Amino acid sequence: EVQLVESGGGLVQPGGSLRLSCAASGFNIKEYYMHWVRQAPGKGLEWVGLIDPEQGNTIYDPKFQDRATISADNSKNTAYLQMNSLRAEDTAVYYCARDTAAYFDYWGQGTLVTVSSASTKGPSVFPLAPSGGTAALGCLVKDYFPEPVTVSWNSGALTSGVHTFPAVLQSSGLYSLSSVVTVPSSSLGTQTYICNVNHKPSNTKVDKKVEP
């Protein structure tokens, strides 16, 4: 069971540095090339660079040659990417990937780095309460920064009928997002619905019961 788990995402000030980790399990990074690829919100994939963990050789896209450093610690079986002098253009989801030579066969989950001078703010979570055979309920996650927020239902077991919408930037410069779930009208009285909201930047975890 090969796994690549990334960490180090979040909010960074313009001119500051990102420091991401890609912890590997199920294989030895020493036997493969490990690469970093990023994707700015709504844009295409962009190659950052690679490292051969065996002897440490690296290759960077010329755009990052002067500001990025890819490295690896075999004893912790982890690859890292550090990039300094960050600007707005560096806001993106960064992925680490295992290269077999032929293709990338395993990927990290991806972590968003947001380059902004704005301050981190945790969201307020409010219920969207149900009013023929189908009803809908949901949660309004409001006034947070920076992205992202993850929303699940009944601790992630409920995915049927769930729709979590893209956040929108409000007039205040803070984000707002809603998640709804459609359900049998009859289930409103025979079962409870709970939305779970996680905003890592502000270490906020909220469980909100949504009742008619």
Binding site: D61, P62, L128, A129, T164, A167
Partner: protein, 213 residues
């Protein structure tokens, strides 16, 4: 660097249709060209490697062809789950470069939205703001219009909306619209409604509630 240009940038086709996507490298890449599929919010997944080989676990409806500078990805019978953005990647020389991506949408039969309206929660009303939300659920095509009315008067400039990516199973879309008012204004007025127009609706559908009731 080697520039990779994909064509077209987006396309839509029906379930069962054949889909073709091309990619041109600015110079010879000697078949070191892979195709990756990326669904919303997920890491890319390889489909084809070395221009023509099908990656393990990938459905046989996917195939790649080409050599030199020109490459083509073919999906023989498009399936709902094939909604995604497809990228070519040349790894013939550094820096490795990706095409800009080609977004593939599924074309399906018209489906009218199911509409729901939500008043602001009491918890939110403890503060200075009130949010009223309207949900347009599982409809197709993506185009839809929502207008808000407070005390039967059409509203302007105080709402924002967002739409989900096409559903991977039924190929529909959902949309959420939020009307924002001050808590003082919300408490002053009574009737709150959202009116929806869509290709699958012969006439507008309105959902509403009266504060208090």
């Amino acid at each position: 660097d080697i520039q990779m240009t994909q064509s077209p940038s987006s396309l839509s086709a029906s379930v069962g249709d054949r889909v073709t996507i091309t990619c041109r490298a600015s110079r010879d890449i000697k078949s070191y060209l892979n195709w990756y599929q990326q669904k919303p919010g997920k890491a890319p997944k390889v489909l084809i490697y070395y221009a023509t080989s099908l990656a393990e676990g990938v459905p046989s409806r996917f195939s790649g062809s080409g050599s030199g500078t020109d490459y083509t990805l073919t999906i023989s019978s498009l399936q709902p789950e094939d909604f995604a953005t497809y990228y070519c990647l040349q790894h013939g020389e550094s820096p490795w470069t990706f095409g800009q991506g080609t977004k593939v949408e599924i074309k399906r039969t018209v489906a009218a939205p199911s509409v729901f309206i939500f008043p602001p929660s009491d918890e939110q009303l403890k503060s200075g703001t009130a949010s009223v939300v309207c949900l347009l659920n599982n409809f197709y095509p993506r185009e839809a219009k929502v207008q808000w009315k407070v005390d039967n008067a059409l509203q302007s400039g105080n709402s924002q909306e967002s739409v989900t990516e096409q559903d991977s199973k039924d190929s529909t879309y959902s949309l959420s619209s939020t009307l924002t008012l001050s808590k003082a204004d919300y408490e002053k007025h009574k009737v709150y409604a959202c009116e929806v127009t869509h290709q699958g609706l012969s006439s507008p559908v309105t959902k509403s509630f009266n504060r208090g009731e």
